[PDB]
C-alpha cells in the first residue's frame, strides 16, 4: 500500500536521475563524426556453395572455430555437421524432440548443443572411441522453451529460456551454478563477449540487459526499441552491440556510455529482422529481414551497401566466420548459402 | 574424381550415405497424421485422450492403419505469437470444449464465465494467419450433466438475448451454431462439429472421417482441379 | 573396443582358407576395413581394403583375384576368403579400421590378428637404417624418404608413422607427419617436407624400444617402408 507507492515513486525518480545523466553525456553522434570518412563502394556478392538437404524449415546453424565446418537444425528433427568448403555432410544427428530452435558448435570442437520447447538443453559428444555420436548430457530445469544457447568453455553452458531467466550450467555436474533473473517477458536471444566474462540478454520487453557471468548480477540495461529484441551480437573491439528488433529497424548500442548510437532503419521496410551480424574489421553490419532477403549495411554512415537477394522464403539464421572469409545464411525454404 | 585423393573419396562416399539415410528417413513422417489439440484446461482434454488412447505433451495411435500423432500444448504457458507458427503444417486443430460448464464461472475473474473464455480463444485461433487452411474439429463435452443442469438452471444466464423452451436439443443446436458462427473465412476453412459424452469408438470415427476429408480435398488441388 | 581374429593355421600348398574378425564395443557399420600382412621376420605389407557400405573394394596386385573380402554387417563380423595358396603367403594378418571424413584419424585400433602358415608405378617408401644403439634418457631420430611427392594441392601430405613392439601389435603414432594419435605421449613428434621426413623421440624409455613403420596413402597400393630397429 503505502510502502509500495512510496517505492514505485522512488523507482520512477531513479528512472528520471538516470535519464538526466544519460542525457548530460550526449554532446555529439555518430553521424555527425563519422560525416568526415569515405564510404565504402557497392558490394558485390556472389553465391558460392549451396547446401541442401534439409527437408524442412531451418531455425539456428553456428560456425566452428575453424571457419571450415558449420552446424545446422531444422524442424525435420535433424542437426547436420557441414564442411564448407567441400559442400560435404561430416555428421548427422537425431533428436528426441524435433520442436528444435537453437543449436551451438564448442569452441574446441569437442561438443554440440541443441534445444527448445521441451525445456531440456542436450550436449552431444562428437569425438567417442566407439565411432558415433551419443548425447553426453541432458539438461533440465527451466519451465519454457529454450531459445538460446551457447558454450563459454569445454565444460560450462549459459543458457536463455521462456520463461524470463537465464542460467549457468555446469556440464559434469548438472546443476545451475548461477540463475539471472530480471525481464519481464520472453528472453529470446543472447551473446557472449570475446573474453567471456560478460554477455548480454534480448527479450520480449523491448528491453536488453548486459549480465556479468562471475558476480550473476545484472549491470546495466538498454532501452529504446518498441517490439520484441529477435537477434543481438557484439561488435568484435567488445564494447558495442546491435540490436535487431521486430519493428523493421536495429540499433547499435554502446556499453562505456549508455546511449543509442546509430539506428538502421529505412522507410521500404516494415518486416522485422530476425539475424543479425558484423564483419571481421566492424564496417559491415548484415541483417536477415523476413521479406524473404537479407541487407548489407555500411555500419559507420548506415547507408545499405549491398543486397544478398538469393532466397525463396524467410530468413531466419546468418553467420560469419572468424576471419571474415565467407557469410552463410539459412532459410526456411531449408536452403543454406554461403557468400562471398 | 580425377582431383580428389584417396581420402578424398571416401568423405564423398559417406556423405551419399547420410543423404540417403535423410531422404529415407523423411518419407515416413510424411504418411501420418499430425493433429493439434487444444481446449481450454478442465474441459474434457484429459479424457479425450484417454478414449482414444493406444513442456509439449506428445500422443501416437493408430485406426483403420493410418498413423496419427497429437500434440498437446496446455503446459506451455509462454507468449503464444512466439512459438505458434511452428505448428504449421498440421492436419487439423481438434477442439475441445465442455458445455456442462456454461453456469460455473471462471475463478480468476467473477464477472465473466467459462464459455465466454472458449469463444474468445475460438475466435483467436481461428483466424490467425497461419491457419487459413487447416480445418478445426469441434468436440462438445460432458453432455450428460448438461441435461440435468439445464432444467434447474435456464441457458439464459449464459445466453442473455436467448428466447427458447430451454430443451436439450434445442439447445446444443443453439450452442453448436453459435460456436460456427465465429469462422470468419467460409472458403479456405470448414468446422466439424460433434457431440459426445464418454462414448467409445464414435470420437475416433469422427476424426478419421474429418481427417480423410481434409486430405481428399488437399489431394483435389494439388492437380489443380479443386 | 575390440576386435578378434579367428581361422588361421597350418594348410596345405594348393588349398583355400576363410578368416573371420568379429568386431565388439563399437559402430562396425560406419568404419572402413584394411586387411594387412606381416612376414616372418620382414616388414608388414598391406593386402584389402573394403568400406563402408560394401561399395569399393581393392585390392593389391599381388593377390588380385585370389583374395576376396566381405561383411557381415548386422552381426558384426568381417570375412576375408582365400583362394589359392602358395608358400609366401605365410604371414600374420591384422584387421585395421578406418574412418574417413574431415579431421578423423585411420588405422586407429589395430586388431590382434591370426598367424598364418603354408607348407611348402607404386611409391617406394624406404628406411635405409637398420638398427639405432641407444641408451635412455637421450633423444633418438629415424628418417623416410619416399621416391614421388607426397604433398597434394589441398596441403595435406598422406604420410603415417607408427610403431610395433616386440611381441604386440603395432599403434597410431603420426598421421600427416605432423598430427598425433589420441593415446600417446608428447615426447614423439614428426616433420619433413616433400620427400624426405623424420620421426624424432625427445626422452627415452625403456618401453619405447622396437620398430617403426613410414607408410604413405597417397593412392591405392599403399606401400610401407622397411623396418628401422632400436636398442637399449
Known amino acids: 500500500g503505502s510502502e509500495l507507492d512510496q517505492l514505485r515513486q522512488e523507482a520512477e525518480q531513479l528512472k528520471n536521475q538516470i535519464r538526466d545523466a544519460r542525457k548530460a553525456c550526449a554532446d555529439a553522434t555518430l553521424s555527425q563524426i563519422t560525416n568526415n570518412i569515405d564510404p565504402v563502394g557497392r558490394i558485390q556478392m556472389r553465391t558460392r556453395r549451396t547446401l541442401r538437404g534439409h527437408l524442412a524449415k531451418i531455425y539456428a546453424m553456428h560456425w566452428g572455430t575453424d571457419s571450415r565446418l558449420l552446424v545446422s537444425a531444422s524442424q525435420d528433427g535433424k542437426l547436420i555437421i557441414w564442411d564448407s568448403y567441400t559442400t560435404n555432410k561430416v555428421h548427422a544427428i537425431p533428436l528426441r524432440s524435433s520442436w528444435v530452435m537453437t543449436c551451438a558448435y564448442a569452441p574446441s570442437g569437442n561438443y554440440v548443443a541443441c534445444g527448445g520447447l521441451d525445456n531440456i538443453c542436450s550436449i552431444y559428444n562428437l569425438k567417442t572411441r566407439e565411432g558415433n555420436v551419443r548425447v553426453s548430457r541432458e539438461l533440465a530445469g527451466h519451465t519454457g522453451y529454450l531459445s538460446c544457447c551457447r558454450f563459454l568453455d569445454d565444460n560450462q553452458i549459459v543458457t536463455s529460456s521462456g520463461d524470463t531467466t537465464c542460467a549457468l550450467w555446469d556440464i559434469e555436474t548438472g546443476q545451475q551454478t548461477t540463475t539471472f533473473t530480471g525481464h519481464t517477458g520472453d528472453v529470446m536471444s543472447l551473446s557472449l563477449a570475446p573474453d567471456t566474462r560478460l554477455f548480454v540478454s534480448g527479450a520480449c520487453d523491448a528491453s536488453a540487459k548486459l549480465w556479468d557471468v562471475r558476480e550473476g548480477m545484472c549491470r546495466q540495461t538498454f532501452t529504446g526499441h518498441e517490439s520484441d529484441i529477435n537477434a543481438i551480437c557484439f561488435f568484435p573491439n567488445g564494447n558495442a552491440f546491435a540490436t535487431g528488433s521486430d519493428d523493421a529497424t536495429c540499433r547499435l548500442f554502446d556499453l562505456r556510455a549508455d546511449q543509442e548510437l546509430m539506428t538502421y532503419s529505412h522507410d521500404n521496410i516494415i518486416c522485422g529482422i530476425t539475424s543479425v551480424s558484423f564483419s571481421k574489421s566492424g564496417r559491415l553490419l548484415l541483417a536477415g529481414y523476413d521479406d524473404f532477403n537479407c541487407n548489407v549495411w555500411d555500419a559507420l554512415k548506415a547507408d545499405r551497401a549491398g543486397v544478398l537477394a538469393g532466397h525463396d522464403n524467410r530468413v531466419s539464421c546468418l553467420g560469419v566466420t572468424d576471419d571474415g572469409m565467407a557469410v552463410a545464411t539459412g532459410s526456411w525454404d531449408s536452403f543454406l548459402k554461403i557468400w562471398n | 574424381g580425377c582431383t580428389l585423393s584417396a581420402e578424398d573419396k571416401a568423405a564423398v562416399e559417406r556423405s551419399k550415405m547420410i543423404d540417403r539415410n535423410l531422404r529415407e528417413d523423411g518419407e515416413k513422417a510424411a504418411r501420418e497424421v499430425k493433429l493439434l489439440l487444444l481446449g481450454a484446461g478442465e474441459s474434457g482434454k484429459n479424457t479425450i485422450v484417454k478414449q482414444m488412447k493406444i513442456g509439449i505433451v506428445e500422443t501416437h495411435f493408430t485406426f483403420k492403419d493410418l498413423h496419427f500423432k497429437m500434440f498437446d500444448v496446455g503446459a506451455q504457458r509462454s507468449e503464444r505469437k512466439k512459438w505458434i507458427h511452428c505448428f504449421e503444417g498440421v492436419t487439423a486443430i481438434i477442439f475441445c470444449v465442455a458445455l456442462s460448464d456454461y453456469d460455473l464461472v471462471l475463478a480468476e475473474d467473477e464477472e465473466m464465465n467459462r464459455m465466454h473464455a472458449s469463444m474468445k480463444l475460438f475466435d483467436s485461433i481461428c483466424n490467425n494467419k497461419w491457419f487459413t487452411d487447416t480445418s478445426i474439429i469441434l468436440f462438445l463435452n460432458k453432455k450428460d450433466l448438461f441435461e440435468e443442469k439445464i432444467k434447474k438452471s435456464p441457458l439464459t444466464i449464459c445466453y442473455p438475448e436467448y428466447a427458447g423452451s430451454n430443451t436439450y436439443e434445442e439447445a446444443a443446436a443453439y450452442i453448436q451454431c453459435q460456436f460456427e458462427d465465429l469462422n470468419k473465412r467460409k472458403d479456405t476453412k470448414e468446422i466439424y462439429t460433434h457431440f459426445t459424452c464418454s462414448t467409445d469408438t464414435k470420437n475416433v470415427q469422427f476424426v478419421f472421417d474429418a481427417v480423410t476429408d481434409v486430405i481428399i480435398k488437399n489431394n483435389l488441388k494439388d492437380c489443380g482441379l479443386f | 573396443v575390440q576386435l578378434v581374429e579367428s581361422g588361421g593355421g597350418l594348410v596345405q600348398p594348393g588349398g583355400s582358407r576363410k578368416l573371420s574378425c568379429s568386431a565388439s564395443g563399437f559402430a562396425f557399420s560406419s568404419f572402413g576395413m584394411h586387411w594387412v600382412r606381416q612376414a616372418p621376420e620382414k616388414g608388414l605389407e598391406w593386402v584389402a581394403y573394403?568400406?563402408?557400405?560394401?561399395?569399393?573394394?581393392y585390392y593389391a596386385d599381388t593377390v588380385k583375384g585370389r583374395f576376396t573380402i566381405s561383411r557381415d554387417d548386422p552381426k558384426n563380423t568381417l570375412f576375408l576368403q582365400m583362394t589359392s595358396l602358395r608358400s609366401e603367403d605365410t604371414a600374420m594378418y591384422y584387421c585395421?579400421?578406418?574412418?574417413?571424413?574431415?579431421?578423423?584419424?585411420?588405422?586407429?585400433?589395430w586388431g590382434q590378428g591370426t598367424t598364418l602358415t603354408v607348407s611348402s608405378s607404386d611409391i617406394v617408401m624406404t628406411q635405409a637404417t637398420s638398427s639405432v644403439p641407444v641408451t635412455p634418457g637421450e633423444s633418438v631420430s629415424i628418417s623416410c624418404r619416399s621416391s614421388?611427392?607426397?604433398?597434394?594441392?589441398?596441403?595435406?601430405?598422406?604420410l603415417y608413422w607408427f610403431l610395433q613392439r616386440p611381441g604386440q601389435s603395432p599403434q597410431l603414432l603420426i598421421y600427416?607427419?605432423?598430427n598425433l594419435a589420441s593415446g600417446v605421449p608428447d615426447r614423439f613428434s614428426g616433420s619433413g617436407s616433400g620427400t624426405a621426413f623424420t620421426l624424432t623421440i625427445s626422452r627415452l624409455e625403456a618401453e619405447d624400444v622396437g620398430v617403426y613403420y613410414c607408410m604413405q596413402h597417397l593412392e591405392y597400393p599403399l606401400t610401407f617402408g622397411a623396418g628401422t630397429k632400436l636398442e637399449l
Open positions: 585395421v579400421r578406418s574412418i574417413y571424413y574431415y579431421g578423423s584419424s585411420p588405422f586407429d585400433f
Open positions: 614421388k611427392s607426397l604433398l597434394h594441392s589441398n596441403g595435406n601430405t598422406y
Open positions: 600427416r607427419m605432423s
Open positions: 573394403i568400406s563402408s557400405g560394401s561399395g569399393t573394394i
